[PDB]
Design a protein around this ligand. Structure first.
Ligand SMILES: C[NH+](C)c1cc(NC(=O)CNC(C)(C)C)c(O)c2c1C[C@H]1C[C@H]3[C@H]([NH+](C)C)C(O)=C(C(N)=O)C(=O)[C@@]3(O)C(O)=C1C2=O
Ligand SMILES: [Mg+2]
Ligand SMILES: [Mg+2]
Ligand SMILES: [Mg+2]
Ligand SMILES: [Mg+2]
Ligand SMILES: [Mg+2]
Ligand SMILES: [Mg+2]
Ligand SMILES: [Mg+2]
Ligand SMILES: [Mg+2]
Ligand SMILES: [Mg+2]
Ligand SMILES: [Mg+2]
Ligand SMILES: [Mg+2]
Ligand SMILES: [Mg+2]
Ligand SMILES: [Mg+2]
Ligand SMILES: [Mg+2]
Ligand SMILES: [Mg+2]
Ligand SMILES: [Mg+2]
Ligand SMILES: [Mg+2]
Ligand SMILES: [Mg+2]
Ligand SMILES: [Mg+2]
Ligand SMILES: [Mg+2]
Ligand SMILES: [Mg+2]
Ligand SMILES: [Mg+2]
Ligand SMILES: [Mg+2]
Ligand SMILES: [Mg+2]
Ligand SMILES: [Mg+2]
Ligand SMILES: [Mg+2]
Ligand SMILES: [Mg+2]
Ligand SMILES: [Mg+2]
Ligand SMILES: [Mg+2]
Ligand SMILES: [Mg+2]
Ligand SMILES: [Mg+2]
Ligand SMILES: [Mg+2]
Ligand SMILES: [Mg+2]
Ligand SMILES: [Mg+2]
Ligand SMILES: [Mg+2]
Ligand SMILES: [Mg+2]
Ligand SMILES: [Mg+2]
Ligand SMILES: [Mg+2]
Lengths: 100, 120, 92, 157, 94
RNA sequence: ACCUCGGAGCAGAACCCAACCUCCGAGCAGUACAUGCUAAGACUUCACCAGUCAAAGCGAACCUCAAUUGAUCCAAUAACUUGACCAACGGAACAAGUUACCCUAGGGAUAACAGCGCAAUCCUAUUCUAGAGUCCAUAUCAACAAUAGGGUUUACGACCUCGAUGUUGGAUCAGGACAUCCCGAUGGUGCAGCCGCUAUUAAAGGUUCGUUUGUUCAACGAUUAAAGUCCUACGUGAUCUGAGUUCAGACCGGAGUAAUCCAGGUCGGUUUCUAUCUACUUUAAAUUCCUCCCUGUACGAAAGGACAAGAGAAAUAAGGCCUACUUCACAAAGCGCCUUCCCCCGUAAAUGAUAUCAUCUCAACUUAGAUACCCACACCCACCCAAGAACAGGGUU
RNA sequence: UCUCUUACUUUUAACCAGUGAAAUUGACCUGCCCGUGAAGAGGCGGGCAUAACACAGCAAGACGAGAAGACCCUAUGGAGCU
RNA sequence: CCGAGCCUGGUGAUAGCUGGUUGUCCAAGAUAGAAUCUUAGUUCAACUUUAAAUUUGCCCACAGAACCAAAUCCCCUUGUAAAUUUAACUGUUAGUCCAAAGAGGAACAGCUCUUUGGACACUAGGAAAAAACCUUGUAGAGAGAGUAAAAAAUUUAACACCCAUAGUAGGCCUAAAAGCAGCCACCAAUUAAGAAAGCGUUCAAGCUCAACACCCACUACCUAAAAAAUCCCAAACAUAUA
RNA sequence: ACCCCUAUACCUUCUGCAUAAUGAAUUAACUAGAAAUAACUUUGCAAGGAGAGCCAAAGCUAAGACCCCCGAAACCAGACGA
């Protein structure tokens, strides 16, 4: 089965809180063939607002998406046509959450 | 595959902050471009080499005048990573016939019509 | 110090359009000026061609602008010529 | 190599320079903001009670007093009609400074407890306190005047 | 002791190269020059409809000059003076 | 296995676009009998050949399908026309095997050995904690799975070499790694002791002789402290061997009409080189076993049974010498004799802050924790020598 | 034969004298380690070493010399046999 | 040198195969493909060269190219100066890496196959040496100058203290299963303790946590390896104004 | 003069050779591009040209200028050899 980055692999619910599932969910997600994480609704929302806040307060005048879309320095000779939509956060099957 | 790049018009819309960053009034736009090739056409596609040859920028660091019209602008938009573009400023107006042989271009991009080689 | 020379406006290479590179090398001891140097004659010819190009492009674009102006002038005269040759009758 | 690999592929050096230039730069605060500058009400009800009635107050230090010994002490002290109150200091001190027993204020340090009644009977307080020798009779008040343990003994005899 | 398999800069296993401060600064300088280019191309003088035919006469005459040269390509003249000049190679004193 | 033609993907949107790439088909059928003639303009399978559409006009009337196919010569025919699974499908008019008895021209454009790339396979370490271990995940073993590493196997690729890079095992000499087989130090134990199991550190020193087999291996016999794992062009053939393997002879079984063949067995079968260059050709600290006592002590219910300290006796390795023995004899040798000296780091503890306890401390801190050899120097013609290829050296009173 | 090799003689050998070849040879003022590279460096990179020159010995390297590979493939190249 | 002697002749046999191919100087010049007893070759195209004739050639504005992504086709301006046709021929048609879209294989290979685009087979500087990565091209002399690309940064794990009676060996099941084998409920006294969250017991018994009090305050950086074979490999340096 | 700095012999072959791929000790001498059909250039004459024959809707006549060396195993004929 193909799995792309940002896709929930398994979902759980019930009369419980995070840490209870988080134990064995981190245990499973460590054993997955890719990088994975145990997330909640709250933690998933928190990381998404964190990524948007980092993109908003980034003090670098130059960004990957600006350079790629404007074809700055002729960088599309070494980029890929998929980088126009990945915006540098993806490299092959790898997702880099530190990239803005 | 690697092909020609269509640059967005959102890239080529200027902003007021850009205007005071590089002072140029949106109304009364500058009339002529001073274009200077600052990079090699080697290790670049043949269409960029052809547009460099069309614009007359075969020799590096040699300024050339071009019109500020949309077609020439489209060519410069294609080849914009190998050149530097400045506005041609005319402090003492256009050169006349009597002032044709005493001109200079200068680094600031101002075509002076009197060149005296004397201190002020 | 090319960046400093650019900030002062004196090119970047000191061997460009300055007094140091554009004044005559020598003159006769009695005071007669030397014949002009080959590089200076060449440079003056290129600057002359550059200035003629500047004048030609500026006047060509100006003439294009006024040609468009007179064209549009003939356009709105022909839409303003809208007098009915005949006075309407019938149900009026 | 394919565009997707099981390992991290080596980028073109211009793309690597692109990533290094387009790294994320956080905002830097100028002068470092770190360097920049319930139970209380209910407990107020029962302490207001036990100081409006119950005019024999005795303060003792809450010695360990293992559970059988503690409860059996509770039972002879109740057989002789006194109560053993345990009220925490964090709500009992402010009541003292705004309720005038500020001279009994500097005495409620450490573990503390209150031997409290409406009847004078300091005689078995002192005999039970002498049966258990490691039990101090820290202090207290009889008839709204402050009395030390020497107070408590001459009011006894 | 430390060798990269195969060739250094091609293949699955390459010698790593790292970005230096001056390489980053050089690239940022070029980025600034192109942002300058973006601004000056963002401000145009005329429009396409105003531009439509302003240099057609000059371009046409330039092409007529090219055609005139390419048509005037033709052999050169020949001279009695040149032939009888070649007679001078036996010009003696006496 | 395929060879010609067509449709779909790869090849998303003008065209084109490969693979012994992924799928589906074709080598016709049905109608008509103007399925006649002629003729602008075009398309085109990347060339040519071949193929495709068609206005108008004359004459009539009032083709479907996707491929559904074959050039020239020549043959048949009065003519019009008609001829190949020429399917190796741009087609030679008509021709198979075998060669180790082989030859030639070339090819590292291309295989075998070796190197290299890669790591599927192989090997190791960690992470997780199911499970096994009476209970107990973590004394020990370990499923599913994840991460990282090695380059010893079998491949895969075809990059150097085919105007030669000689090959398996064996001898001889070994250099190196440590992922340690023994000896050393240490932690844990389901460690009472003896034995073990597991882990950390340690590469100075060591790691046997035989029967069968060409064998690497493997099995067995007898030991030992141990009989390590690898790499070195599967180290090492201008140092050796040639049992094997893949030249010419022959036999057996099988295959083939036969020649001949077998990734089957068997018997036999030439291993050249006078060293030009590089490199090198005398660098004194040795380990291990056993015996005695400690001691039948510690320990243990008993059976069993130590570690330290110390004494002795050997064995090998290195260096040397002939008194005797022995080969032998103005001498050279071993089978004989003599000598052989330092540590080594894993961790275990004390004081004591960050964190007024504690804490062995990437806190400050405390403890366990070499000498020897050589050393002077135009007597030199010549002679002698325990010195020596020449040279050099020692003696000549 | 070997454990396990030792001693002597002859030849060879080395020195003096006489005579005097061959294969080989791009040029050489011809080092070591690691890395690199047509993927195994005396000659390239980083380090280390380094007065010159004979004589004897060795065979680890010069992918050492010899024979336009004896295996494999190719050729609209041959030949023998059935 | 007998799988068919040797000599002479045919004979200068033939060789899509190897080797070689001799003055000087300048210029233009790099690889779509189809057939083929063909894939070590050749012919046609494609590219390339020369000489002519003529007029448009590249870049491209809007509109436009089908139902079941990057882009391309077409194309007036504009920027430029090339293009087509005519004549005459050679040679190249055994291809390498890098970026991108894919296919095969192991989402192996310095692997193989197409497509778009670079560079290499041509110069120079840089990434250590260096084909293919980066910078840069049109030629000479100079004991002048401004620059391009261009030098890797990182160092990680301290965590509380004190306390604990009891309705009850809650009920059912079981020999007993007592908070802790499995089920139903989960109330309730003390100031404050789950009909018990881990251990531990055949079951019991025991010891930790959550709870009172106590108090300064939970102090809380949320992170993580190592191996091979001749000999580690520039020397080094935290602090003088970009 | 060396010492300092720069610098990977040549030819062929190749995708690419310092290559540890080929050839070469060195000297002297010898040793390898032959031509038609057309085209192009330059003359002569010109609806004709060429010293019969041939070509001709500007052609014809003349000249110039363009196509290597070495090498097999083999096949056949006639001799000479026990
Ligand atoms: C060395 N021997 C075992 C041998 C081996 C092979 N085969 C190999 O190359 C096999 N080597 C491998 C194992 C594949 C690496 C061989 O191929 C040969 C030979 C021998 C030669 C003998 C030749 C001989 N001459 C040249 C010395 C000769 O005169 C005769 C003769 N009888 O007249 C030959 O037969 C001889 O030419 C020959 O045939 C040999 C080989 O072919
Ligand atoms: Mg390498
Ligand atoms: Mg066509
Ligand atoms: Mg019709
Ligand atoms: Mg065929
Ligand atoms: Mg065919
Ligand atoms: Mg045989
Ligand atoms: Mg041969
Ligand atoms: Mg191999
Ligand atoms: Mg279990
Ligand atoms: Mg290949
Ligand atoms: Mg070979
Ligand atoms: Mg050779
Ligand atoms: Mg050889
Ligand atoms: Mg170890
Ligand atoms: Mg070997
Ligand atoms: Mg050898
Ligand atoms: Mg043979
Ligand atoms: Mg025999
Ligand atoms: Mg030999
Ligand atoms: Mg040498
Ligand atoms: Mg002699
Ligand atoms: Mg090397
Ligand atoms: Mg020697
Ligand atoms: Mg050969
Ligand atoms: Mg062929
Ligand atoms: Mg020939
Ligand atoms: Mg040229
Ligand atoms: Mg063919
Ligand atoms: Mg061929
Ligand atoms: Mg390749
Ligand atoms: Mg090759
Ligand atoms: Mg090279
Ligand atoms: Mg060499
Ligand atoms: Mg060779
Ligand atoms: Mg060579
Ligand atoms: Mg060769
Ligand atoms: Mg023949
Ligand atoms: Mg006879």
């Amino acid at each position: 089965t193909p799995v792309k980055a940002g896709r929930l692999v398994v979902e759980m619910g019930g009369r419980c809180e995070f840490e209870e599932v988080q134990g064995f969910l981190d245990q499973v997600a460590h054993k997955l063939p890719f990088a994975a994480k145990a997330v909640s609704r709250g933690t998933l929302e928190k990381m998404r607002k964190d990524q948007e806040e980092r993109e908003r307060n980034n003090q670098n005048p130059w960004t990957f998406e600006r350079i790629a879309t404007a074809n700055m320095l002729g960088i599309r000779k070494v980029l890929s046509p998929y980088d126009l939509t990945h915006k540098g956060k993806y490299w092959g099957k790898f997702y880099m959450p530190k990239r803005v | 595959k690697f092909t020609r790049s269509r640059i967005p018009e959102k890239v080529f819309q200027a902003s007021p902050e850009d205007h005071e960053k590089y002072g140029g009034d949106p109304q009364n736009p500058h009339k002529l471009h001073i274009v200077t090739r600052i990079k090699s056409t080697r290790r670049r596609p043949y269409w960029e080499k052809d547009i460099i040859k069309m614009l007359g920028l075969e020799k590096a660091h040699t300024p050339q005048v071009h019109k500020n019209i949309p077609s020439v602008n489209a060519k410069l938009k294609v080849v914009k990573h190998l050149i530097r573009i400045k506005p041609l400023k005319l402090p003492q107006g256009l050169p006349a016939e009597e002032n044709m042989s005493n001109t200079c271009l200068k680094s600031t991009g101002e075509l002076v019509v009197q060149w005296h080689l004397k201190p002020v | 110090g090319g960046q400093w020379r650019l900030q002062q406006g004196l090119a970047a290479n000191p061997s460009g359009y300055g007094p140091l590179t554009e004044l005559p090398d020598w003159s006769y001891a009695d005071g007669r000026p030397a014949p002009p140097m080959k590089g200076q004659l060449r440079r003056k010819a290129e600057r002359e061609t550059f200035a003629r190009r500047v004048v030609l492009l500026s006047q060509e674009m100006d003439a294009g602008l006024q040609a468009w102006q007179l064209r549009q002038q003939k356009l709105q005269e022909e839409q303003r010529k809208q007098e009915n040759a005949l006075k309407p009758k019938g149900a009026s | 190599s394919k565009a997707v690999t099981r390992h991290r592929r080596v980028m073109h050096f211009q793309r690597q320079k692109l990533m290094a230039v387009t790294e994320y730069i956080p905002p830097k605060p100028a002068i470092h903001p770190s360097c920049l500058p319930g139970l209380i009400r209910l407990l107020r009800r029962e302490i207001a009670a036990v100081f409006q009635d119950n005019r024999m107050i005795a303060v003792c230090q809450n010695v360990a007093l293992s559970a059988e010994d503690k409860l059996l002490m509770r039972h002879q002290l109740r057989k002789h009609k006194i109560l053993m109150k345990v009220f925490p200091n964090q709500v009992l001190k402010p009541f003292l400074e705004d309720s005038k027993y500020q001279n009994l204020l500097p005495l409620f340090v450490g573990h503390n407890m209150l031997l409290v009644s409406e009847e004078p009977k300091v005689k078995e307080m002192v005999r039970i306190l002498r049966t258990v020798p490691f039990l101090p009779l820290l202090g207290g008040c009889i008839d709204d005047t402050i009395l030390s343990r020497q107070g408590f003994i001459n009011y006894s005899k | 002791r430390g060798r990269i398999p195969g060739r250094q800069w091609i293949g699955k296993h390459r010698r790593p190269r790292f970005v230096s401060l001056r390489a980053k600064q050089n690239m940022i300088r070029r980025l600034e020059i192109e942002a300058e280019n973006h601004y000056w191309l963002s401000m145009p003088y005329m429009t396409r409809e105003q531009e439509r035919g302003h240099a057609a006469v000059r371009r046409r005459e330039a092409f007529e000059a090219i055609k005139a040269a390419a048509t005037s390509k033709f052999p050169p003249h020949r001279f009695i003076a040149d032939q009888l000049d070649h007679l001078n190679v036996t010009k003696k004193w006496s």
